[PDB]
Every structure is written in structure tokens, then in C-alpha cells.
Amino acid sequence: NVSVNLEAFSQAISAIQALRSSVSRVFDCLKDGMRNKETLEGREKAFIAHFQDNLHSVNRDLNELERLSNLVGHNSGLLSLDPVQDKTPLYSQLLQAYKWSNKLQYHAGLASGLLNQQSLKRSANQLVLPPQYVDDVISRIDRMFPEMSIHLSRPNGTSAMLLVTLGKVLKVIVVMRSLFIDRTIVKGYNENVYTEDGKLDIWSKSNYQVFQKVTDHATTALLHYQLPQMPDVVVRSFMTWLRSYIKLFQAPCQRCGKFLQDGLPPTWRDFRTLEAFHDTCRQ
Amino acid sequence: NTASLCRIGQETVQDIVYRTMEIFQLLRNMQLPNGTYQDRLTKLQDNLRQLSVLFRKLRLVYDKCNENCGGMDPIPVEQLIPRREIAEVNKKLKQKNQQLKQIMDQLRNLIWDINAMLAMRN
Amino acid sequence: DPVQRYKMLIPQLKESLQTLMKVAAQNLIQNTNIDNGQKSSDGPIQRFDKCLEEFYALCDQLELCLRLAHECLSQSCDSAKHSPPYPQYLAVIKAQISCAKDIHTALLDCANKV
Amino acid sequence: KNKLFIKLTRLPQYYIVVEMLEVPNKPTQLSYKYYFMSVNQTRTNAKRKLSDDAFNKVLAHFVAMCDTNMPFVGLRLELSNLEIPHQGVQVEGDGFSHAIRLLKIPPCKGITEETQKALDRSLLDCTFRLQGRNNRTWVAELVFANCPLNGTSTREQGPSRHVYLTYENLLSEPVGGRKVVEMFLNDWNSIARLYECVLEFARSLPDIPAHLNIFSEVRVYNYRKLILCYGTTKGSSISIQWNSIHQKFHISLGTVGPNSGCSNCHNTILHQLQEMFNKTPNVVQLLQVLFDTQAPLNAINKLPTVPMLGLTQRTNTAYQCFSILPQSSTHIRLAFRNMYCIDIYCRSRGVVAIRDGAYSLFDNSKLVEGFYPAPGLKTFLNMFVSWAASIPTILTHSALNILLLPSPTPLAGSYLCSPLERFLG
Amino acid sequence: VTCVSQMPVAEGKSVQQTVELLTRKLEMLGAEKQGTFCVDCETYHLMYVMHNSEYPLSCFALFENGPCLIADTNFDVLMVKLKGAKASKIETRGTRYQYCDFLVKVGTVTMGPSARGISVEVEYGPCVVASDCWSLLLEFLQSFLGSHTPGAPAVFGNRHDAVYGPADTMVQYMELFNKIRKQQ
Amino acid sequence: STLVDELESSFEACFASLVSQDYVNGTDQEEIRTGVDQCIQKFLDIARQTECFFLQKRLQLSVQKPEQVIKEDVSELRNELQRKDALVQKHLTKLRHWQQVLEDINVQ
Amino acid sequence: LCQPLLDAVLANIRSPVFNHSLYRTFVPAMTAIHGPPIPSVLQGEVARLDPKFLVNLDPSHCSNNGTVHLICKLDDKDLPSVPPLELSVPADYPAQSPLWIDRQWQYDANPFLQSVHRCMTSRLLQLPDKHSVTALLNTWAQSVHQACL
Amino acid sequence: NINDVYESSVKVLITSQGYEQICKSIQLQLNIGVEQIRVVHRDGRVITLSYQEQELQDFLLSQMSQHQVHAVQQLAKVMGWQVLSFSNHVGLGPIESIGNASAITVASPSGDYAISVRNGPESGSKIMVQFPRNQCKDLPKSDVLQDNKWSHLRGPFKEVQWNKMEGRNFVYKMELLMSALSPCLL
């Protein structure tokens, strides 16, 4: 990407301004040196202290400047070098629209965020969907992630049960009503999942306790991500969690990363931060 | 319908806030074609129209509620406290609800049953 | 030519600033002497205001190079996020501008409607 | 011979052991005697509770009472570890929640002894309470009395303006570790330095100059940040607050009202303004430097600075037609692609000066670094009023706006050049 | 993700009393004790065939640094009818404890009548390719054995990309047995 | 400017921050964040206050005019009655449909 | 690179014309490039108390001098009315425990009162080193309550 | 809608009468199985109820109390108030309670008047409100406080008669009250 190069250059602008500011500070607080007050020795300590501090500011700034001096780094350009659109007021309008669009983007993003966090609805009063559309959204979230082999299968018909697997760790089962996740069974990578025919046992257990606790936490996640009014986003938000459960068996916990508090690895990925702190350590 | 005015205006304010939320939402999704989609602009416009409607609505309901239809109001303090037709409609409602719950129970039993069987051998 | 020019100024800027501080010390010593009498210096002065102005100048040139870099970079990046046919390109440009303006003007209309 | 240890994991160094031995002569009833314990594989103490006023209500209750009362102990101990003098655990009013009301806050340098006395006479109480789903978030509601300023939110109206500081720990340190009071003291320090600045402002508020008073009124102050509008009509807003992670102030500019530009014209000077306001923390001086340098900058931003690919003989090189580079407070410099660099000083009530920045101020023979001088600029800037350029010429703050606002050429192409762009170009 | 290692006598106490010490520690941790286990091996000519109690319907035959096929219990009979052995057998035998989703076996390796040493086997039940989970196994054994040490053996299986069945377990077993016969 | 004028003005600000008319020059995310924060907070706060006003009026109306609130109740109840028998009738139609279908599949 | 100016400035900090030297060398250039330039804490704790502990200042004494005396009388419907507790605050307080005034002239008669006194003196002795008036009054409430047993 | 021969499942969500969208904690997922009912709580807990019925009665009642005390916080956020908030579990060891326990919260207004909500199962909900010392004539003004600046601190506590006040459900009643102590735009 080029965002990192952009950010480097931005910090570099800030740093060069800081350097000029520091030089000016030095010489300006030097222009009126030993101010007057309160002592004879106090004057000396204060003045020498602030002068040393300003010089250290200069040095720090020059260090940051050489630092960013290490990590150095289309068709629009052709638009300028065309002696027809140059005479007309164009290419000012174009970059104008580009900037206004970027501004609308960031502006509306933050606005919508702050508004979603603080909603007033407090009311609702004052659904079958196309199964093909269910398949569409499931496939969309399947493509959306690198390693989540989502495999929709519909025994019992309009149920649309799933089976997610992710890499040697934690293959799960999802039985969704209709884009409404209802249950979840988290089994290990070596579980019998299909009963005797390819039934995709909607109903078994996990023989190992770790995955049993993960199943409990997964049902909690289901309950927590609810957010009515068009649950298209619900499933994406859930698959983000389940994606986080990769690197489950090898990661510490946030508090006292023993890796095993009572024989159980960290099993509670937070609904926002998404890292750690196994259940005993959270509740 | 006075308290009706109060409640409806209250809900209109929530409608204001939620409409603004979705308006910013639609704005965030916008794309600046690179496409000719143009349905975006349609939803934006006809969305912005409802906001305009609700504002005049709020002015109207505010006016009608602060109209103060002969009310010598006491300040909230001392209000914190430290008709048969209502009863009839409530009784009819409770009865109809009970019948609905019998129906819901019957359907629940049928669904449990049909599930037991098919899931057993289908 | 941002990278080479920045790498070309930073050492030059450091050299200029070192000269600056040294001339500051030179003039301060000279002047506090001549105030306390006690001595003089027959040698030339090495005027200081010139040195500070030269340093500000070099800082300014670096500011120019780096701002140009960031602006051209963001320009090209935003051009990327909205593009992949030269006259066809001009056409999609005109379309883009029109769409942006229509969004802006609809917002202006709803705001003016109050 | 029969034990059941209850480990309360919110704070996993305390246990609620019981015992369940027997009752004599009744072979079916059972006894229960509960003991609070601490562990640091070691062991510290045990204290038998005695309150005897299927579900074991009494002991669900004791484990509860042990849950939320115990973080208050941690905070009290770590609060006495520093010199803050705290009242007791203090069940507040209805026997529903504990609190700790910091009697008086420890003095925080550096604050001039006057404003320290003002703060002491300002706060009435600062009390900590436990507020969280995890029991790991404290809130300190501290009330102040003689508010110097009153913002335009109609909720500050009221004598005592309450302020709440919310703190949680990282779950790794204790529930009430030293980190919470360190943070509270840092926030007291932020409130303190801001109180200093706002008290100066409040003493000055009577007989502040009329022009300032017309343009820019106070928006909100609550106690933690100060937000001031601008004028015509309350377009923009500055936000002064103290950031005790950098030990310096931080002014963030913003746009609020309609009539102003797309962005705060002053954003070009934000870093310079920040250095200024750190050196001299005097809000009146800042409002003054914003009054001037309001319309100059509002004209200067509205100049094209967009890289054009094909200017010079080498058609491959971008050149940034204009470029605004501020020299550190109020003295910004325009710069054609690289060759010409006029510099514009802002000044007293109206005027705004225009030198030719290429000419070195201390020498008249030398051209500063790279940018050559613009022949004949003195004539032109006089029109709107050898090396004669370097003497600063003066323009009356609306000539400048006519000097930069795009305008048609004296089919003209309809390009909207600026009357300064064309000359130097 | 089984891990095997040889715990010395540390005499100290007797080899059985060493097993007693381990049993006491593992009971102290709070692990329930399940039915005994037993693994034994034979070499032919060089081919190794070995039986395990965790898999009592399948007997594994392994060539050192080669193939390792699992077979049905009726692979002993094929080796019987194939005479076209050395009585260097080895036979571990001990009790099986169960932690939370965590199984650990200790045994007194016996050749003939003379127990040559003590062998401990730990297998974190729910697992996949070891390269991701060996951290946790070390985390646990550092409490149990780490006093002496555990030393990463799954490097016998960590070179690969991603797979883990039950064979590599008996591979490790054979490696240990070859180590216990040689030195006294 | 009783209350509703305040809300209109606040909404006007919260949008018109960006739209106004003028050349844009870089957008420097931070000032956008600060502007959106202040505008949106004032908007939600004037919403706070209008809701408070309406609710206070309802409390007054309750302590004064109880005929009004009881009639509100009778209105809501009858509306729910209509919604209820509508739902049950829809379900009855569905039951008839599937009944005929099932017994037909039996006849075939 | 700062060492020259550093030792130069440190050389002449004492000279009475140091300010003139700093001004002469620098101010010309710097203007050439930049243009022209009742203890009232006890009041708080008494304010924020629980209503049951109505506390006034002693009619005897003159609270004016460094330490204000207090005459606080328990209320609260649940409790049993007892004798008042006379407080004294060492104006250096906080970090100064407010004295109690012990008197069998108060409690001697009856058993309930003497039990109150036993519980009070014990628990107060336990109270650590930093008593605030709220600590005393809370302790007293707990003592009355525990004597009601 | 999928009930297998072995084990069934249901969701139970307790909500306030009108405020639903706005307030929704206290959600569960029973797994009814042969001889045990496993409960998974939104908060993250996993309780294993026995096969009896009184147990489920009790658990659901405990959740009902907790829900009232959670709904008050959700409403205070809904708009208008800052929270000096609760303990889900403990309150302040005020009284014993036979269903597990009770949770109490305390949220202040924009300016002054703080309200407080205690509620436990089979120990009636008690909501009392605070006042500034200004508005209470009863409290005997102590001489020790001599100043005026101090009067406007939050003061005492005065219980609110629930069974009377006004409203349909408990969140509605508390909302009318919580608006009733607002800056009083009338």
C-alpha cells in the first residue's frame, strides 16, 4: 500500500515544523534571558533549566528528522498536460470533486459512527427471505475471509445449516433460522461431525472441554451481536469473531498470560478488542 | 388527543434522529462512479424529503402541545408523589390473548412432534 | 524528486544548524566581552542574522519539497482509488464531477429548505 | 474435614472459605460458618463472620458483599499510599453504594499559589464510586462552585457545574491499582492548568476590546476543555485543553456553523498557533492573533495548490503552482512553483504586509536560497495600494482579498485566475 | 499432539518410588485417574511392530525413518505366519490420568524383569498440527516435569507443514525405546 | 427559538459543516473529527431537551387530565384487538391451505 | 552541536549586564525575521453527610480559633436515641484525628449506655491514624447499632 | 424450529413493556435436555439448572429483577443522564434476599438531582431520589456549614411512592420521573 508512505511524509511535515519551532524557541526565550524574580539561585536554576530543555527539544527534533529521512518512499497527471482541458476550468473541478468525496467519506463515517453509538429509538411499534439470497450472503462472507471454508447444506429444508472450518482449529456448525443464527456447535478439528450419513449433526457435543466452553461463548456471541433492523451485518460481525478464534491455542491471555488458568486456554475473545482473557479471568 | 400529541411528537424526534442516522449512512456508502449507478442519488433525495416533512410536523405538534388548553400547571415537584369501559376492553383483550396462547401452544406441540418424527428418520 | 532531495537537504540542514549555533556562541561571547570590556577580538565578526536567515531558508526549501511530495502522493493515491481510453477517461471524469456536484447540491437544497 | 473455598475472581487474592461440620443432636440440620481469607501458595488471615439475623440466601449475600466492597479497600489503601487525605468507605445515603470522598486534592505543580487557592475554594467534593459490568470502572464526580465562565449550552446554567472522570484499568494491574489515582491526579492537573488559563481570561473579560467581544463568544467550558467560537457568525471553534502525556497544551480547530468556509481557515497555522499558545498561555492574546490572520488566511487558503505535471522544459516534473508554507506564527509565505516566494506578514488592526521573500532581509545583494526574485512586484503591489521590493509594502486587508480572489482577465477562457497569480506567472 | 520424554531416576529414591512421586504430584494437581495403559514393542529382521492401549484394534508397524502403516489387530498373525525376532521386547505399563481435556501417562519401562527407566507420555486431546499447540504443552509440562525439563520432541513432527494423526506418537515411542535399551 | 428552532438550527449545522459553497483545501482529518464531534453532540443534546419537554407535558397531562390518558389506553387496546384478530385470521387461512394440501397428498 | 552556545551562556550567568548582552546580540535579528512581538473543609464534610447525623457547632466555645468544636446528635428512625457526641477537630486536620470526649458522666447509668461506650471506645481505638469526622460518626452509628445487637 | 430427538433449545428474552429496541440485555438461551436445563446468558455466564421447576421459576425471577435494574441504566443512556452505576450482584449488603440477589444503580441528571434504583426479587423495588439542600426545608440547617456556596451540593434521600406515581410499566414510570426532574422547561 501507499498509505504508509503518505503517513511517513505527513509526520515528516510535522517534524520539520517542529524543528523550526524549536530553533525559534531557543533563540526567543534567549532574547529575554534571566527574567527576574524570587531568588538569586532560583533565577539561575530556572534559566539554565529551560535553556537546556529547549536545546534538547532541538536535538530531539533533528533526530526525528533523520529518522524519517531513513524511511523514505496517474492518469490524473496526464489530464494536466493536455492543451485542451487546461484552458477550460477543468482539472480544478476534478481534484475538487475528489477532495470533496474524500471529505464526505471521512465526515459521514465519523458522523454515522457517533450517531449509531447514541441512538434514541427506544421503540419499534409506535421474516422469510429468498433462500438464494441466504446463499448469496453466506457466500459473500465466505469469500470475505481467507481461511473459512463455509459449506452451506440444507437438510430439513429451509433451515440452511452451515459448517465452518478454519485450519486445524475449531470447525463449527451454524444452524440459522433465516439469516438469524439460532445455534452453534464448536467441535475440534478431529470430530465425527457427520452422523452416519452426511447429516451434519446439528446436535452433538464436543468431547473436549475447551471446545465445549467455546460453544458456550459462541452462543453468547450469537445472543450479543443481535442488532435487529436488517440482520445482514449480524452474520459478518459473527464471522469476524469466529475468525478471531484462529490462533486460539497459541496466544496468551491479557491478564497473567499463564496460557492455562485451570487447564483451559484463553477462550473468550472480546466482542470488540478480540484477543484474550479466558472466562475465569473475565467473570 | 393532547397526550396523543405529546407521544407522537416524542416519536417524531426519534424519527428525526434515526433519519439523520440513515442519511449519513447512505452518504458514507456513496461511491462517485468510476458505473453510472445513480440509484444512490435517488435514495438520497427521497430520503431527504422525509426529514423536511417531519420538521414541519414537529413545529405543528409543538404548537399544539404548548397551546396550553386552559391549564394552570403546577411545577413537577409535588407531582412525583413521595373508566369502566377501560375495564371491559381490558377484559376482552385478556380473554382474546388467552385463546391466542392456547393456539400457540397447540402449534408448538405440533411442531415439536413433526420435528421429532422427521428428524428421527428423515 | 522527493527522496533524493530530502536526503540531500538533511545533511546540509544539519551543517547549517551547526554553523548557526557556533556563530550564536561566537557573537554572544564577543558581545558579552565587549560589554564587560575585559577584551576584544580583532578577527572578523561572522554576522549572525545572516546565518539564522540561511537556516530558515533551508528549512523552507525542505518544507516545499516535502509538502509537494505529500500532495502529489495523495493526489496519485486518490486518483488510484477512483480509476483503472483517453477520451473515455475524460468522459468518466466529467461524469464523476457531475455526480459529486449533484450530491453537493442536493445537500445544499435540503439545508436551505431548513 | 469439610471445606468449600470460594475464589472470587474479580480480585483473586481473597477467598471465602466456609466449613460445614455438623450440628449436634440434630442429625438432619446442618451448620455453616463462613471465613474470609487472603492469599499472597502462602496465606495471610481469616475472620469468621457472625451475622445471624434450598437456596443459601445468606451466603450468596456474603459473597456478593465481598465482591463489590473489596475494590474499595484496594483503592483506599493505594490512595493512602499517596498523601491524598480520604474520608472513609462511607456508605452513601441509602445503603446502596460505597464511596470515597477525597477531602482535599494534593497540590499539583505548576500552579501559581493564587489559582491553587481558587481551586481549593472551587471544588466542593470529589467522590469515587464503582460503576461497571465488571466492577472495574470508577467514576469521580467532582463539583465546582464559582464558575468563571458560562458557555452556550443552557445546561451549564446552574451554580455548580459537575464534572465526571471515567477510569478503568487494563485488567492486568489490580482493580484499584496505583494507576487509577495516577490518572486521576493527571486529570486534576489538566483541570488545574486550564483553570489557570480560564481565570486569566475571566479577570480580563470585563473591558476586553469591543472587536473581540463582538467576534467570538464562549461555546462550552465544562471544566475539562474550553471551546470558543469565532464571529460572523459563530463560524469556527478552538478547543484548548492540556494533554498530560506531552505536558503541553493542544488546540484543535474545528468548523461548526454555516457561514464559514469548508474548513477553518486557521488550520494552516495550527502548529504555529499551538507553539504560540504554549509559550504564552493567554487566551486574550490568542483571540487577538485569531482576529487578525482571519481574513488574510481566508484569502490565502483560497489559492490553487494542486500539482501540475507539465510546467517546465522537463514535462515530467510536478511543481505545485502555489504553496502556503507558514513561518511559525503569523508570517506565512506564498511560493510559486519554486521560483518566486512572496511573503505576507499579518499586522495590526487592518494592514497586511507583502515583501518579496526571495531577497535576504539582512542583505540586499543576496537571494536567499533557491527562489529568484520576482521582477517588478513592488510596482504591482503598489498598483493595488533595483532591490526596492524588499521594503515591505502595506495593503489594507481588503485589497488583499481582491488580490487573491479569482477573477476574470482584464473569450477570456474563463479560467478564474487570481490577480496575483497572473502577475508573477 | 502427544509428547513423550524419558524422566531419569534421580536417585534419590527408587524407580517405583520415582513413579510414586510423579503419581503424587499429578494427583496433587487435581487430575482423575483412568484405566491403565500399556505399550509394547518388538523388532524384526529392521522392522518395529508395537501395540498401544489407546488404540486396541490397531497395531502399528514402523520402519525407522520410513513408512509407518497402521493395521488391524490381525497383523500380528501375518508376522507369525511370516518366518522367512530377537526377544528384545519392551513393555511400558502404568496408570492413565485425565486432566481437563488433557491426558498424561506414566510408566515403568520394562525389558525382561529389569525396569530400565521411567517414561512419561502427555497428549493434549483436542489438537491439530503440533507447530501451533506445542506452546501449551510446554506450558503444562513445565509444571509437571519441567523441574528436570521437557525438551521439544514434536520437532520429530514439526518439520512438516500441517498434519497430525496417531502414528507419530508411536514413532516417538519407538525412538524412546531405542534410547532406553542402549544405556543402563 | 423556543425549542424546535434550536433543533432545526443544530441539524442545519451538523450537515452544513461541509456542504457550504467553497473551495476545499486538504481536509486534514483532525479538524473534521472535531467539527463533527461538536455539531453532533449539540444535535443529540437538543434532541435530549425536546424529548424532556414532551415527556414533562405528558406528566402534567396525566396529573391534570386523566380522561385523556384513559382514552389513550382505550384507543391503543382496540387497535391491538384489530391487529390480533387480523393475525389469527391470516393464520387460519394458512391452516386451511395446508390442510387441503396435506389431505390431498394423502388422497394421491 | 549545542555545546558552544551552552558553555557560552553558562559562562556569564552572573554578570549584571548579561541581559544587555543577550538583548544586543539577538533582538535585532529576531525582530528582523519575526515582526514586533470555620475551616471550610469541615464545612464540606458536614455538608455531605447522611441526614441522620444532624451536626451543629457547640454553643459552648467559640469556634473561631483554630479548632471548631461540634455537638452532633444521632437521629435515624431505626435507632435508639442516645447521648450526644461532642467532637473536636484539630484544625491541622486532615492528617489529624478529631478527638473524642470520654465521660462516664454520660454513660454509667444503664446497661445499654455502658455497652454503647464499650463498643465505641474499642472500635474507635481500632480506627486508623487518619480519622475524618465521617469516620468518627460512622463508627458511632455502628456502635449504637451493635449495642442494640 | 429444529427440535431433535435428544435435546431442544429455546430463547428467552425479557423485555420492558415499551422499550425494547432500546433496551435489551438480560437475554438467555435454554438448552432443554433430558434431565437438565443449560442456560447461557448474554452477559457470558453458563448455569446448569436442575430438572425441577422451582429452579427455573427462581432463575427467571432473578433475571427479571436484574433486568429492571439494567433497564434503568439503558434508559439513562437512551438520553439524558450520567451514571454512578450499579453492582449487578451486591447493592450494598442492605438486606438478605431469597432469589439470588439484587442490583442497584444511581444516575445523576444534567445538573443536580440524582435518582437511585434498588431492586431485588421478592424484596420490592425501591426507588428514592436525592435533592439539593436548597429544596428541602425539613433538614435542620446546621450552623457548621456557614456559607452559601455549599448548599447546592447533592443532599439527602427521599423515597418515591411507586404504587401511585404515573405510568404503565416500571421503565415508563421511571422515565416520567426522570423527565420530571429535568431543568423544567415546563
The answer, yes or no, to whether the previous bond of E12 is cis (omega within 30 of 0) is yes
Alpha-carbon distance of A207 to A220, in angstroms, equals 20
Q: Do chains H and G touch (3 or more CB pairs under 8 A)?
A: yes
Question: Among candidates D90, D187, D80, which has minimal Cα distance to D142?
Answer: D187
Chain F contacts to A (CB-CB under 8 A): 14, 17-18, 23-27, 29, 32-33, 36-37, 40, 44, 47, 51
Residue C62, burial from CB neighbour count under 10 angstroms (0-12, 13-18, 19+):
buried
Which cell numbers hold the place of C81? 482509488
* Residue F46 backbone dihedrals phi, psi, to 5 degrees: -70, -30
Q: Are H16 and H24 in contact (CB under 8 A)?
A: no
Number of H helices, E strands in chain E: 5, 8
Alpha-carbon distance of D178 to E134, in angstroms, equals 37
Closest in B80, B116, B119 to H180, CB measured: B80
Alpha-carbon distances of D362 from D367, E123, G27, G29, rounded to whole Å: 11, 82, 14, 8
Alpha-carbon distance of A242 to A147, in angstroms, equals 11
* Residue H91 backbone dihedrals phi, psi, to 5 degrees: 60, -120
How close is the nearest chain A Cα to the Cα of H140, in Å? 42
The residues in A 187-206 lying below 8 A from H, measured between CB atoms, are: 202-203
H183 touches chain D (CB under 8 A): yes
A98: Cβ contacts below 8 Å, ≥ 6 apart: C78, C79, C82
Number of Cβ within 10 Å of residue F45's Cβ equals 18
Q: Are D112 and D196 in contact (CB under 8 A)?
A: yes
Under an 8 A CB cutoff, do F40 and A115 touch?
A: yes
* Residue D227 backbone dihedrals phi, psi, to 5 degrees: -120, 120
Which cell numbers hold the place of H141? 440547617
Under an 8 A CB cutoff, do D320 and C75 touch?
A: no
Q: Are D248 and A57 in contact (CB under 8 A)?
A: no
D15: Cβ contacts below 8 Å, ≥ 6 apart: D5, D6, D7, D8, D36, D37, D38, D39
How close is the nearest chain A Cα to the Cα of G22, in Å? 6
How many CA atoms lie less than 13 Å away from C86 in the CB half-sphere? 8
The residues in G 22-61 lying below 8 A from H, measured between CB atoms, are: 38, 40, 42-44, 46-48, 50-51, 54-57
D333 touches chain C (CB under 8 A): yes
Q: Are G133 and G70 in contact (CB under 8 A)?
A: yes
The residues in A 167-186 lying below 8 A from E, measured between CB atoms, are: 167-169
Alpha-carbon distances of D203 from A257, C54, D115, H117, rounded to whole Å: 54, 43, 12, 43
- Measured between beta carbons, which residues in chain A are less than 8 angstroms from residue D414? 88-89
Under an 8 A CB cutoff, do H22 and A122 touch?
A: yes
Residue C101, burial from CB neighbour count under 10 angstroms (0-12, 13-18, 19+):
middle
Q: Are D151 and H107 in contact (CB under 8 A)?
A: no
H80 touches chain F (CB under 8 A): yes
- Measured between beta carbons, which residues in chain F are less than 8 angstroms from residue B27? none
Under an 8 A CB cutoff, do A58 and G2 touch?
A: yes
Q: What is the resolution of this structure in A?
A: 4.8
Alpha-carbon distance of A212 to A205, in angstroms, equals 7
Q: Are D135 and D68 in contact (CB under 8 A)?
A: yes
D305 touches chain F (CB under 8 A): yes
Q: Are A208 and A232 in contact (CB under 8 A)?
A: no
- The residue among H87, H123, H135, H139 with the most chain D CBs within 10 A of its CB, best to mutate, is H87
Q: Are D257 and F13 in contact (CB under 8 A)?
A: yes
Q: Are H135 and H111 in contact (CB under 8 A)?
A: no
Chain B contacts to F (CB-CB under 8 A): 1-4, 6-7, 9-10, 13, 16-17, 20, 55, 58-59, 62, 65-66, 71, 73-74, 76, 79, 83, 85-86, 89-90, 92-93, 96-97, 100, 103
Alpha-carbon distances of F29 from A102, F23, G62, rounded to whole Å: 10, 16, 63
Which cell numbers hold the place of F79? 387497535
D135 touches chain H (CB under 8 A): yes
**b/e map of D88-107 (b: 16 or more CB within 10 Å)?**
bbbbbbbebbbbbbbbebee
Terminal-to-terminal C-alpha distance of chain F:
75
Alpha-carbon distance of C109 to E180, in angstroms, equals 88
- Measured between beta carbons, which residues in chain D are less than 8 angstroms from residue C75? 306-307
How, if at all, do strands H36-41 and D236-243 pair?
unpaired
How close is the nearest chain H Cα to the Cα of A122, in Å? 4
* Residue H43 backbone dihedrals phi, psi, to 5 degrees: -60, -25
User: In this complex, which chains have at least 3 CB pairs below 8 Å with chain H?
Assistant: A, B, D, F, G
H/E stretch holding D35 reads strand D35-38
Residue G11, burial from CB neighbour count under 10 angstroms (0-12, 13-18, 19+):
middle
Alpha-carbon distance of D305 to F31, in angstroms, equals 20
Question: Among candidates E8, E2, E1, E3, which has minimal Cα distance to E109?
Answer: E8
Phi-psi region of D125 (alpha: psi -120 to 50; beta: other; left: phi over 0): beta
Under an 8 A CB cutoff, do F21 and C108 touch?
A: yes
Nearest chain D residue (CA) to H155? D93
**b/e map of D341-361 (b: 16 or more CB within 10 Å)?**
bbbbbbbeeebbbbbbbbbbb
How close is the nearest chain C Cα to the Cα of B57, in Å? 13
Q: Which amino acid is at H84?
A: L
Q: After which residues do gaps appear in chain D, with C to N over 2.5 Å?
A: 40, 53, 385, 410
Alpha-carbon distances of B57 from B11, B14, C113, F72, rounded to whole Å: 11, 13, 14, 20
Alpha-carbon distance of E120 to G102, in angstroms, equals 72
DSSP for D109-151, written as a single string: SS--HHHHHHHHTTEEEEEEEE--SSS-EEEEEEEESS-S---
Q: Which residue has the cell 516545499?
A: C64
- Measured between beta carbons, which residues in chain C are less than 8 angstroms from residue G34? none
Alpha-carbon distance of D371 to D366, in angstroms, equals 11
Q: Which amino acid is at G107?
A: Y
- The residue among G12, G15, G27, G31 with the most chain A CBs within 10 A of its CB, best to mutate, is G27
Residue D27, burial from CB neighbour count under 10 angstroms (0-12, 13-18, 19+):
exposed
The answer, yes or no, to whether the previous bond of D110 is cis (omega within 30 of 0) is yes
Helix %, strand %, coil % for chain G, to 5? 40, 10, 50
Alpha-carbon distance of B30 to B28, in angstroms, equals 5
Which cell numbers hold the place of G49? 453527610
The one-character DSSP state at E10 is: -
Alpha-helix residue ranges (DSSP H) falling in chain G: 3-11, 18-33, 42-47, 111-126, 133-148
Under an 8 A CB cutoff, do A120 and B17 touch?
A: yes
Give the strand order in the sheet containing A181-187: A164-166, A169-176, A181-187
Per-residue three-class SS string for B12-26: HHHHHHHHHHHHHHH
- Measured between beta carbons, which residues in chain F are less than 8 angstroms from residue A104? 18
Torsion sign over Cα H107, H109, H115, H117: negative
**Please, which residues bridge with residue D126 across strands?**
D102, D142
Under an 8 A CB cutoff, do E126 and A265 touch?
A: no
Alpha-carbon distance of A124 to H20, in angstroms, equals 7
Alpha-carbon distance of D346 to D354, in angstroms, equals 9
Terminal-to-terminal C-alpha distance of chain E:
29
**Please, which residues bridge with residue H33 across strands?**
H36
Q: Which amino acid is at C51?
A: C
Give the strand order in the sheet containing E2-7: E2-7, E114-123, E102-111, E90-99, E32-44, E47-51, E58-63, E70-72
Q: Are H99 and H61 in contact (CB under 8 A)?
A: yes
DSSP for D367-417, written as a single string: B-SSPPP-TTHHHHHHHT---GGGSPEEE-SSHHHHHHS-B---------B
Torsion sign over Cα B24, B26, B30, B36: negative
Q: Are H105 and H85 in contact (CB under 8 A)?
A: yes
Q: Are A187 and A204 in contact (CB under 8 A)?
A: yes
H/E stretch holding D296 reads helix D295-300
Alpha-carbon distance of H153 to H112, in angstroms, equals 8
Angle between helices D270-279 and D283-291 (to 10 degrees): 150
Question: Among candidates H132, D326, D35, B35, which has minimal Cα distance to C83?
Answer: B35
D195: Cβ contacts below 8 Å, ≥ 6 apart: D115, D118, D119, D122, D148, D223
H182 touches chain F (CB under 8 A): yes
Closest in H99, H116, H153 to D96, CB measured: H116
Q: Are D140 and D127 in contact (CB under 8 A)?
A: yes
- The residue among B80, B93, B105 with the most chain H CBs within 10 A of its CB, best to mutate, is B80
Q: Which residue has the cell 492455562?
A: A260
Number of Cβ within 10 Å of residue A274's Cβ equals 12
B37 touches chain A (CB under 8 A): no
Q: Are D150 and D156 in contact (CB under 8 A)?
A: yes
Torsion sign over Cα A25, A30, A35, A41: positive
Q: Which amino acid is at C104?
A: H
Under an 8 A CB cutoff, do A72 and C7 touch?
A: yes
Number of Cβ within 10 Å of residue A69's Cβ equals 17
Which cell numbers hold the place of A77? 497527471
H/E stretch holding H38 reads strand H36-41
Alpha-carbon distance of E104 to E107, in angstroms, equals 10
Alpha-helix residue ranges (DSSP H) falling in chain F: 4-19, 29-64, 66-107
Number of Cβ within 10 Å of residue E167's Cβ equals 15
Phi-psi region of H174 (alpha: psi -120 to 50; beta: other; left: phi over 0): alpha
Alpha-carbon distance of G6 to A43, in angstroms, equals 17
Alpha-carbon distances of E13 from E22, E181, E183, rounded to whole Å: 12, 21, 19
Question: Among candidates A192, A199, A220, which has minimal Cα distance to A279?
Answer: A220
How close is the nearest chain B Cα to the Cα of A256, in Å? 41
- Which own/partner contact pairs does D139-142 have at CB distance under 8 Å and 24+ positions apart? D139/D164, D139/D165, D139/D166, D139/D167, D139/H82, D139/H83, D139/H84, D139/H85, D140/D164, D140/D165, D140/D167, D140/D184, D141/H82, D141/H84, D141/H108
Alpha-carbon distances of D82 from D138, D187, G45, H127, rounded to whole Å: 18, 16, 21, 37
Closest in G47, G55, G70 to H150, CB measured: G47
3-state secondary structure of D229: strand
- The residue among D243, D255, D416, D421 with the most chain F CBs within 10 A of its CB, best to mutate, is D255
How close is the nearest chain H Cα to the Cα of A167, in Å? 26
F7 touches chain D (CB under 8 A): no
Closest in A99, A111, A120 to F36, CB measured: A111
Q: After which residues do gaps appear in chain A, with C to N over 2.5 Å?
A: 73, 126
